[PDB]
Amino acid sequence: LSSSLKTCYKYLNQTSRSFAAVIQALDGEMRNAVCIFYLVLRALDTLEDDMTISVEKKVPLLHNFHSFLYQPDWRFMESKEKDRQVLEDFPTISLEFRNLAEKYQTVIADICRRMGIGMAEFLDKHVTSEQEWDKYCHYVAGLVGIGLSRLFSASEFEDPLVGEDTERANSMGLFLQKTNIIRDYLEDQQGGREFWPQEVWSRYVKKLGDFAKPENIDLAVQCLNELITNALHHIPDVITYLSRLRNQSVFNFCAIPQVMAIATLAACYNNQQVFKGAVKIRKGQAVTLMMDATNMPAVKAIIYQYMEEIYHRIPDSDPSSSKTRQIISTIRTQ
Numbered sequence: 361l362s363s364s365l366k367t368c369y370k371y372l373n374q375t376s377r378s379f380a381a382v383i384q385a386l387d388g389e390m391r392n393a394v395c396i397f398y399l400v401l402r403a404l405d406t407l408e409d410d411m412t413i414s415v416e417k418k419v420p421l422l423h424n425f426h427s428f429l430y431q432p433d434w435r436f437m438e439s440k441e442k443d444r445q446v447l448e449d450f451p452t453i454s455l456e457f458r459n460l461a462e463k464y465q466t467v468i469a470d471i472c473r474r475m476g477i478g479m480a481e482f483l484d485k486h487v488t489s490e491q492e493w494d495k496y497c498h499y500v501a502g503l504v505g506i507g508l509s510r511l512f513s514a515s516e517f518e519d520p521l522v523g524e525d526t527e528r529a530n531s532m533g534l535f536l537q538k539t540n541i542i543r544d545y546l547e548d549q550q551g552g553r554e555f556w557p558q559e560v561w562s563r564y565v566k567k568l569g570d571f572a573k574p575e576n577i578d579l580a581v582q583c584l585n586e587l588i589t590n591a592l593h594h595i596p597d598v599i600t601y602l603s604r605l606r607n608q609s610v611f612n613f614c615a616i617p618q619v620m621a622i623a624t625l626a627a628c629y630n631n632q633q634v635f636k637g638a639v640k641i642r643k644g645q646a647v648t649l650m651m652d653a654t655n656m657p658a659v660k661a662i663i664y665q666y667m668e669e670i671y672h673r674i675p676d677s678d679p680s681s682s683k684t685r686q687i688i689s690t691i692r693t694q
């Protein structure tokens with residue numbers, strides 16, 4: 361490996377942890393392409409997240425980010441976020457970007473362009489409706505799914521359908537993003553960031569922050585269960601997506617995070633601890649199960665097991681209880 365590429369994998373290992381391992385196991389040209397895609401998205405996200413950068417200054421950075429991939433000198437030395445190194449050493453990342461085959465570059469640049477436009481759109485609004493929730497998640501995560509799928513198809517290890525079915529790829533990304541948003545309520549609230557959709561939470565409390573108050577715990581958990589139920593509606597598309605993958609390393613790369621997100625939602629379901637910090641995800645149980653689960657029947661079995669755990673815990677009086685049973689029964693019969 362070149363020194364710059366070595367550096368990129370160091371950055372991947374430092375700034376991911378969640379994806380670092382599955383990425384390094386990808387076959388042939390997919391490995392570098394996905395590594396660089398990850399690092400580029402990490403840089404863009406680090407700009408978006410940085411609340412020390414004013415809106416006026418941030419908007420052009422997000423819009424023009426895709427063009428910086430082609431500016432060999434471009435770096436950003438003003439970030440105060442924890443992943444700032446990817447911005448300060450951006451030339452190393454963009455150089456390895458320009459070392460990828462054109463067919464990968466085109467995908468990565470296009471997704472970066474579209475993500476930047478979408479992230480900037482949300483700088484001046486919170487998330488209101490459930491449709492707006494889906495739109496924000498599309499911009500920050502569904503497009504990652506679509507990008508990854510287009511990389512898989514461009515590599516020719518997967519069929520054109522994987523890249524073409526943007527709805528299924530979008531659902532894959534939405535499922536991860538919604539799960540993270542649900543899980544991270546308190547951390548986000550403490551850092552002054554709000555991602556739960558107002559049209560949902562405002563039916564329970566007057567301010568999203570009010571879910572951190574102990575007197576509102578019952579309402580908080582109702583809202584939590586409603587949002588979890590919404591996220592579960594992506595699982596049918598996740599199953600469809602995973603069922604089409606031919607390459608073992610691509611299958612593992614795609615399946616592992618989805619299962620971890622399912623285990624997370626199961627741990628969060630009807631759980632007061634969401635509102636007091638990190639909940640005990642039985643993530644060890646999921647990691648252990650996924651070691652062996654390298655095919656669709658094994659992954660389905662795991663999905664059902666976690667759905668069954670949620671199902672038998674649905675409180676009779678929970679306002680979403682009928683909906684939660686309904687989506688679980690649908691998933692079971694996919």
Ligand SMILES: CC(C)=CCC/C(C)=C/CC/C(C)=C/CSP(=O)(O)OP(=O)(O)O
Pocket residue numbers: 375376377378379380500501502504505506508509529532533536537540613614
């Ligand atoms: C494969 C496919 C079609 C779609 C999946 C698309 C993906 C990967 C969307 C990413 C969504 C999120 C929330 C990643 C952060 S999890 P994290 O914070 O634990 O990740 P990290 O450790 O920062 O790398």
Ligand SMILES: CC(C)=CCC/C(C)=C/CC/C(C)=C/CSP(=O)(O)OP(=O)(O)O
Pocket residue numbers: 379394397398401402405409500501504508537540
């Ligand atoms: C596997 C692969 C090719 C790419 C990984 C997906 C990445 C890094 C997407 C960048 C934008 C997002 C949604 C970061 C979520 S981690 P977070 O804790 O920063 O979530 P937040 O942006 O605050 O909503």
Ligand SMILES: [Mg+2]
Pocket residue numbers: 405408409500
């Ligand atoms: Mg962000």
Ligand SMILES: [Mg+2]
Pocket residue numbers: 540541544
């Ligand atoms: Mg988060």
